């Protein structure tokens, strides 16, 4: 297994393409996005991005860049979880996630 | 970053408003909720709630489970998280960036 | 609370029923699945989340999904720690004590 940070961004849907561009420019290999309901009826339609990164640095760079650009003006939360990647051709490369020295 | 507990509730979709009322009364600052599927594949719902303490998370879990989960299907679990940004979660002071 | 392993699988939507079969055959008690998007334009994919009482059960699901599909279909599998607080099926009738 390969260590990873899982970065989660929950914010306004209008920001979808701008945030995707930031993730793309970061070096992260990819992302998952989903429609959510958010209360922060007063439920509103949000989006949630999930990004695995190999380093905590990469995750903080994405978080910092999203927040600095948008979070004065738009509601949002960004948080980080630990994770281990078991399989993932792009994340782990072709040697896979359980290579030996 | 600020430590958080992430409380997840997966349950029947008919309980959405009922469970949202409990979360709103708890003092948690917000929640996300999403439409999901479970083994029937039948439509259900998933809430995710960040709390500043484990006690707050447990109080929400206890109240939801006792009120509904002896009558409706539901599962409640908790994970650790660290919050980097969040005006409402961390407050106007921010998420303690040098901690 | 009961310690648990949270296994997540993100893969192509066409695989939904075939992955669900592997989860069901594993001994896992159930799963949540959702429609998601991935970098494409974004394109549609699916995400499963499965809680298991042991690590080896999670890995057995991961290994079986990757060996059958991941030479031919895109996919990522990862694992997180969790604790279950309430869950009649996961914890048994005594609860998650």
Swiss-Prot record, chain C:
A GO term from the CC aspect: plasma membrane-derived thylakoid membrane
SUPFAM superfamilies registered for this protein in UniProt: GlnB-like
BP GO terms, sorted: regulation of nitrogen utilization
Major location (coarse): membrane
Membrane topology: Peripheral membrane protein
Subcellular location per the Swiss-Prot or TrEMBL entry: Cellular thylakoid membrane; Cell membrane
Database matches in Pfam families: P-II
Induction: By limited inorganic carbon availability.
Keywords: Cell membrane, Membrane, Thylakoid
Example of a GO MF term: enzyme regulator activity
Protein name: Membrane-associated protein slr1513
UniProt source species: Synechocystis sp. (strain ATCC 27184 / PCC 6803 / Kazusa)
Lineage of the organism: Bacteria, Bacillati, Cyanobacteriota, Cyanophyceae, Synechococcales
